[PDB]
Design a protein around this nucleic acid. Structure first.
Ligand SMILES: [Mg+2]
Ligand SMILES: [Mg+2]
Ligand SMILES: [Mg+2]
Ligand SMILES: [Mg+2]
Ligand SMILES: [Mg+2]
Ligand SMILES: [Mg+2]
Ligand SMILES: [Mg+2]
Ligand SMILES: [Mg+2]
Ligand SMILES: [Mg+2]
Ligand SMILES: [Mg+2]
Ligand SMILES: [Mg+2]
Ligand SMILES: [Mg+2]
Ligand SMILES: [Mg+2]
Ligand SMILES: [Mg+2]
Ligand SMILES: [Mg+2]
Ligand SMILES: [Mg+2]
Ligand SMILES: [Mg+2]
Ligand SMILES: [Mg+2]
Ligand SMILES: [Mg+2]
Ligand SMILES: [Mg+2]
Ligand SMILES: [Mg+2]
Lengths: 148, 141, 179, 68
RNA sequence: AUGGCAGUCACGGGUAACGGAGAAUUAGGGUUCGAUUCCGGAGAAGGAGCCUGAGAAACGGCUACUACAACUACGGUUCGGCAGCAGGGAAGAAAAUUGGCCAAUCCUAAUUCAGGGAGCCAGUGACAAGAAAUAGCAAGCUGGGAAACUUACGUUUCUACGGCAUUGAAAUGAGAACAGUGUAAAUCUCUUAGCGAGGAACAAUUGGAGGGCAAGUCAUGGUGCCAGCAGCCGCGGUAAUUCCAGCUCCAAUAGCGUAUAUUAAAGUUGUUGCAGUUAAAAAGCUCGUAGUUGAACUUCUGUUCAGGUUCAUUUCGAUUCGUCGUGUGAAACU
């Protein structure tokens, strides 16, 4: 199978995590799937898989070696507060990313031309996804998850 | 010594002298006197125009021949132009009043040794490169 | 809003005299000797040899004990060594000049793969280092105009390529229909 | 004149081109063939003062065979 | 009060002139450009005026005029100024999508969560730059050869080799693709399984073949000073080496012609580095303030010490693949 060598590692107590460079050796098989790399790593570190997030990879011009960077968080409860909204939909935890631009630009249109009376109403119709909403969803992953 | 003065204090002199004695150069005297801007193209490299009529011109000295030429009207400039239509059948494509793209022949001035007072080449008919119309497998309207 | 900042540079060099009988003859005798493709390549090489001598002359213009020369001179030589253009016993800058384009041409992935009996020809080799059939260092080299450094001239095989790994390109397409 | 436009071309009998027997290698190959047909050591071998013109083979079938 | 500036060029005019950082070619010295990512300046239709503010004469704020753009029930109105992006019109030789997003870089705000055509993504994109395929190997036939075997054209062999509408299987990106990587998403690249090359194929052009300028001594066809070529010499008037075209060749080659400005060749604008009897060029001749240019003298010199430096060496100690230390002489430095 694969052979991973961990390369450059820092210790960030601030965001409570350790950052490391990864060098996957797959001489034979094609680039490793982030997923599979996620676990062969968690095993060498001996840490829950979901508390280890791996991002950015490459693949030297045909040679079976891929470089990448990963993250080790101690509390998935920390990981959930720090990681980016986009990395979460990626583990299928946060979800969708609907097209805000267009409509938001159009509401600006109406609102900029009204008095408070209606404005409030309009606002009660701008494409969802509040941050207040992002949190409640983040929170639910919090309680409902426990293990390792 | 020679004419030029060799003083370390006389730089000014030599300087003004060169700036002066330099007008004796046509290449200099040329661009320096915004001459390029007064020609029919107004400095330009190419010019669009409408065919005023296909006329023919006679060769000079040891040559005797009917050269194909089109009298063109440049657009923003608005001047009468003498334009030589290149290769063999060429003029057979230029229909009177079509749009033509013209450029000069070897340094804007002397026409090809053969031609008389023609200073331009015709490269496009209705916006269709001539060469293209010259080779069957290319284009035609 | 386009504001690039990467850098240009032409590897070319157009010659003044466009039809030198004697010059063209060498370029061709050269292209045929090194399995080149276009005259360009040949100039690409001359242009390189240039940067070296122009830097050698630039340095010779200095006192023999110039902080600059002493440092840049040596480092230039050190580089002629890593690419093996001058032999150990050819330190002195003055030698940087007597460098045949023929010599610098010989230190290419092309010229090497062939002179390493690793190919049937100056050409055979050319399509090879192309089909990936050749790995150098810990990486694979595809570009025939590689500047083969001395140190790594050992590491030159075919890692996981049909002629060492596991072929089946023209083979597969072949044997299946035979039946 | 005028109507005398392109008198020549119109009068020319359109001959056709010899449909490529095989192919003309385009790439290092062509430059290779050339290297061989002229600067290959057997020609640089015989006098450099008595070697033929890269087109004396004007396409002459009679001198084409005499050489080969 | 009467000064202030000026041939050591005032004042005035031109500039297809916003200044720099820099850009192109360069023996040296030069020549020509700099709208254009940095900086500084100026401006927002022209022009003046102003509110406000710590801060602008702002201008994606306001007032009037000149010329305009949008609506009108013609009373009146516009948060009317794209030299911001995306787009039209116009000009013209000439320059892309009325796309995506806030994920990265930074910015702004009451501000860890909000907004940003800054900016980044992507589309268009041979401006331009980097790497690079259009084939490689071998059998056989065969030219060459060649080393040989050897008085002649014959066999062995081999080789820098070199040819082929003959042979043969390996190789392989273009291509096209489940996966993975990458991404805000999407496209692409990269890794990679199933599929993917043998002749009009899966592909080279462009521009020439008298001279300059590399390449036809074809006894080729058509044309007949006509059509046309030609950068400059010159081609062409019935046997064209330059036209039209075939063939074969050459050159640069995913590129190659052309037009124009510009650099070098230009010691053809020359300080370096020209010319001036006759080729262009000494004024007809003298005076003469500006300018340019100016003779020779003023501690030289000697002795000794010292630090290196070099160089020399009928020479010494060390090391090696080329240096150090020691001694003399010498010079000069100090
Ligand atoms: Mg948002
Ligand atoms: Mg004449
Ligand atoms: Mg492979
Ligand atoms: Mg002025
Ligand atoms: Mg300027
Ligand atoms: Mg600016
Ligand atoms: Mg200032
Ligand atoms: Mg715009
Ligand atoms: Mg952002
Ligand atoms: Mg935001
Ligand atoms: Mg407050
Ligand atoms: Mg882009
Ligand atoms: Mg390119
Ligand atoms: Mg995919
Ligand atoms: Mg075959
Ligand atoms: Mg051709
Ligand atoms: Mg021609
Ligand atoms: Mg011809
Ligand atoms: Mg003839
Ligand atoms: Mg040229
Ligand atoms: Mg001149």
């Amino acid at each position: 199978t694969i052979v991973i060598r961990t390369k450059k590692i820092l210790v960030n107590p601030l965001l409570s995590r350790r950052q490391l460079s990864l060098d996957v050796l797959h001489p034979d098989s094609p680039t490793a799937s982030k997923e599979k790399i996620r676990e062969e790593l968690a095993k060498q570190l001996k840490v829950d898989a979901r508390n280890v997030v791996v991002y950015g990879f490459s693949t030297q011009y045909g040679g079976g070696k891929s470089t990448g960077f990963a993250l080790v968080y101690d509390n998935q409860q920390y990981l959930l507060k720090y990681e980016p909204n986009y990395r979460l939909r990626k583990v299928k935890i946060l979800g969708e990313k609907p097209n805000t631009r267009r409509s938001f630009k159009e509401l600006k249109r109406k609102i900029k031309r009204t008095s408070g009376k209606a404005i409030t109403k309009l606002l009660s119709e701008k494409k969802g996804d509040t941050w207040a909403s992002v949190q409640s969803k983040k929170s639910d992953h919090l309680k409902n998850f426990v293990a390792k | 010594g020679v004419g030029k003065p060799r003083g370390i204090r006389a730089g000014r002199k030599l300087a003004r002298h060169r700036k002066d004695q330099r007008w004796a150069d046509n290449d200099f005297n040329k661009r320096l006197l915004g001459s390029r801007w007064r020609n029919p193209f107004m400095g330009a490299s190419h010019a669009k125009g409408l065919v005023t009529e296909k006329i023919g011109i006679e060769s000079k000295q040891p040559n005797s021949a009917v050269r194909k030429c089109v009298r063109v009207l440049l657009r923003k400039n608005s001047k009468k132009i003498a334009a030589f239509v290149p290769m063999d059948g060429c003029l057979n494509f230029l229909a009177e009043n079509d749009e033509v793209l013209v450029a000069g022949l070897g340094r804007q001035g002397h026409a090809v040794g053969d031609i008389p007072g023609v200073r331009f080449k015709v490269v496009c008919v209705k916006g269709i490169s001539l060469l293209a119309l010259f080779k069957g497998k290319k284009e035609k309207r | 809003m386009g504001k690039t900042y990467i850098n240009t540079s032409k590897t070319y060099s157009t010659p003044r005299r466009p039809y030198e009988k004697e010059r063209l003859d060498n370029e061709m005798k050269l292209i045929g000797t090194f399995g080149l493709k276009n005259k360009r390549e040949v100039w690409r090489v001359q242009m390189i040899l240039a940067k070296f001598r122009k830097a050698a002359r630039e340095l010779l213009t200095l006192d023999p004990k110039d902080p600059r020369r002493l440092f840049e001179g040596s480092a230039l030589l050190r580089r002629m060594f890593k690419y093996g253009l001058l032999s150990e016993q050819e330190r002195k800058l003055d030698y940087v000049l007597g460098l045949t384009i023929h010599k610098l041409m010989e230190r290419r992935l092309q010229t090497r793969v062939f002179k390493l009996n690793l190919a049937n020809s100056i050409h055979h080799s050319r399509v090879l280092i192309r089909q990936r059939h050749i790995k150098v260092g810990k990486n694979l080299v595809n570009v025939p105009s590689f500047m083969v450094r001395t140190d790594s001239e050992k590491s030159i095989d075919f890692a996981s390529t049909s002629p060492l790994g596991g072929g089946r390109e023209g083979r597969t397409k072949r044997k299946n229909a035979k039946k | 004149t005028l109507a005398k436009a392109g008198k020549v071309r119109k009068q020319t009998p359109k001959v056709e081109k010899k449909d490529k027997p095989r192919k003309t290698p385009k790439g290092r190959s062509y430059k290779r063939i050339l290297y061989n047909r002229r600067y290959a050591p057997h020609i640089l071998a015989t006098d450099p003062k008595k070697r033929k013109s890269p087109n004396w083979h004007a396409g002459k079938k009679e001198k084409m065979d005499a050489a080969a």
